[PDB]
Design a protein around this ligand. Structure first.
Ligand code: HEM
Ligand code: CM5
Ligand code: 85D
Length: 464
């Protein structure tokens, strides 16, 4: 039998037992009653929730033969339709995961490492903040520009300038789209898309925004193909175009133009909106807890100094700064319910039977807030990741990128981005804002698929 859960009504599923504050709060109320493994009916679909690091790990690691499927996010399914690595399943996922892992890591002889691309971008960012004259800003656009530019360097062999209005228009579409998908309407759509799709709504705007970004991608593909040198691929798009040409006699080849456009858009969305949202939370946390920002700056002065650019080899020597970044990720809890999975075959789990095709949510938020691993888990406290001697204390509960076959494929890049960009900004700038620390409100602006911080203003003041 499926795991236990609240009794549903036909058509409405468990609607009348949900919490108006959203899906995550609804599921944490059900966890109170049912424990770590339970079923909730989201409209017409039974979805099994797994909570706590033990259960999520038993599923994604111990039973990866069954739990490695990708489930559906209703607000974006109409667009992606199972194309791209994020939303693919089956053999398509195998091929696209392998291609994407290889091309996001290996760039050719004579090409910059991920590290150098981040270090270059971080110097562009510092120059922009110096030219910002200490003015107030919402730093969103810059955190999206630096993260998007790392991916653009890999995918398109170039970066965009921070002043490029056409680049900013695309970043505005990523930002609005992640907010829409995470809205109360987007969560209602997860329950009732069958019915709601026939009316006007945010799902239509999400579709329009994604198509607008994808239009750029399609045109870039067309240009790349026009100038492609098979002997010298310039970037990930050329590499995929050479696979496409190799397999062109197979009508079923997975190297198709829809996979190319949507894999590429998936890489940008996942690599831009994630890390820039974490940076957004990270700097709002530094405004609320300036003594943490001061102690990081102390550590940068002591290990790096005021001038030499941070490098990844510095991390080992900077346990307090790394604890801070771990704690920003833990606290931010970017994807509280992770990204939906589905089971790929009939599975037994803890005495229950989960039929092939059942959707499963791994509630990552419950690991990141497990009070056995993090004392007082609702408070921001970098000591969560430090032992008594101030050495870094890593923990198996720290799973913000998930686990198993679908584990975030950008994990290495994201962690390098968080560390180089956080340290290079704090090396050169301190932070201030009009709101006193006591008054800063960390309550997210949206909390659905994504947890998104409230807008805020910040100044970066040059040091010395
Ligand atoms: C702080 C930054 C990030 C966080 C917290 C994060 C988190 C996650 C999570 C929780 C998943 C779902 C894994 C699952 O299905 O169980 C995921 C998937 C994914 N992420 Fe990340 N992500 C981050 C940054 C990035 C970056 C920088 C990239 C691109 C370089 C990226 C690319 C992807 C891709 C392509 C997938 C789909 C993997 C698949 O289905 O095989 N992520 N991410
Ligand atoms: O290609 C079809 C569309 O072409 C024209 O659009 C342009 C606009 O001319 C043109 O200014 C523009 O430039 C965007 C440049 C920055 C791209 C930033 C990338 C960041 C990473 C993810 C992909 C986007 O791209 C759009 C699509 O190529 C039109 O303006 C739209 O009408 C039209 O539908
Ligand atoms: C927003 C995310 C956390 C990242 C990019 C796209 C997603 C689905 Br629209 C998930 C994976």
């Amino acid at each position: 039998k499926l795991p236990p859960g609240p009794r549903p009504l036909p058509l409405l599923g468990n609607l009348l037992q949900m919490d108006r504050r959203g899906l995550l709060k609804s599921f944490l109320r059900f966890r109170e009653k049912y424990g770590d493994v339970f079923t909730v009916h989201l409209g017409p679909r039974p979805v099994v929730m797994l909570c706590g690091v033990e259960a999520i790990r038993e599923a994604l690691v111990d039973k990866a033969e069954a739990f490695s499927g990708r489930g559906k996010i209703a607000m974006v399914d109409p667009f992606f339709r199972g194309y791209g690595v994020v939303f693919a399943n089956g053999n398509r996922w195998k091929v696209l995961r392998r291609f994407s892992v290889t091309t996001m890591r290996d760039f050719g002889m004579g090409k910059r490492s991920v590290e150098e691309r981040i270090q270059e971008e971080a110097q562009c960012l510092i120059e922009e903040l110096r030219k910002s004259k200490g003015a107030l800003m919402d730093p969103t656009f810059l955190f999206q520009s630096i993260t998007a530019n790392i991916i653009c360097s890999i995918v398109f062999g170039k970066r965009f300038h921070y002043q490029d209005q056409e680049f900013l228009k695309m970043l505005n579409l990523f930002y609005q789209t992640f907010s829409l998908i995470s809205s109360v309407f987007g969560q209602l759509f997860e329950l009732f898309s069958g019915f709601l799709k026939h009316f006007p709504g945010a799902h239509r705007q999400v579709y329009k925004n994604l198509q607008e970004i994808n239009a750029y991608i399609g045109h870039s593909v067309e240009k790349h193909r026009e100038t492609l040198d098979p002997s010298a691929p310039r970037d990930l798009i050329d590499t995929y175009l050479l696979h496409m040409e190799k397999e062109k006699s197979n009508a079923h080849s997975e190297f198709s133009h829809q996979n190319l456009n949507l894999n590429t858009l998936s890489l940008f969305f996942a690599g831009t909106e994630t890390t820039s949202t974490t940076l957004r939370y990270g700097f709002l946390l530094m405004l609320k807890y300036p003594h943490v920002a001061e102690r990081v700056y102390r550590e940068i002065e002591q290990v790096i100094g005021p001038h030499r650019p941070p490098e990844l080899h510095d991390r080992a020597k900077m346990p307090y700064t790394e604890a801070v970044i771990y704690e920003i990720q833990r606290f931010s809890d970017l994807l509280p319910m992770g990204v939906p999975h589905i089971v790929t075959q009939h599975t037994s789990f803890r005495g229950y039977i989960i039929p092939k095709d059942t959707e499963v949510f791994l509630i990552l938020s419950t690991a990141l807030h497990d009070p056995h691993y993090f004392e007082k888990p609702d408070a921001f406290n970098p000591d969560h990741f430090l032992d008594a001697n101030g050495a870094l204390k890593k923990t198996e509960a720290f799973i913000p990128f998930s686990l198993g076959k679908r584990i975030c494929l950008g994990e290495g890049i994201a962690r390098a981005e968080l560390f180089l960009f956080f340290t290079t900004i704090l090396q050169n700038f301190s932070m201030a804002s009009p709101v006193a620390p006591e008054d800063i409100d960390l309550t997210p602006q949206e909390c659905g698929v994504g947890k998104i911080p409230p807008t805020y203003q910040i100044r970066f003041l040059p040091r010395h």
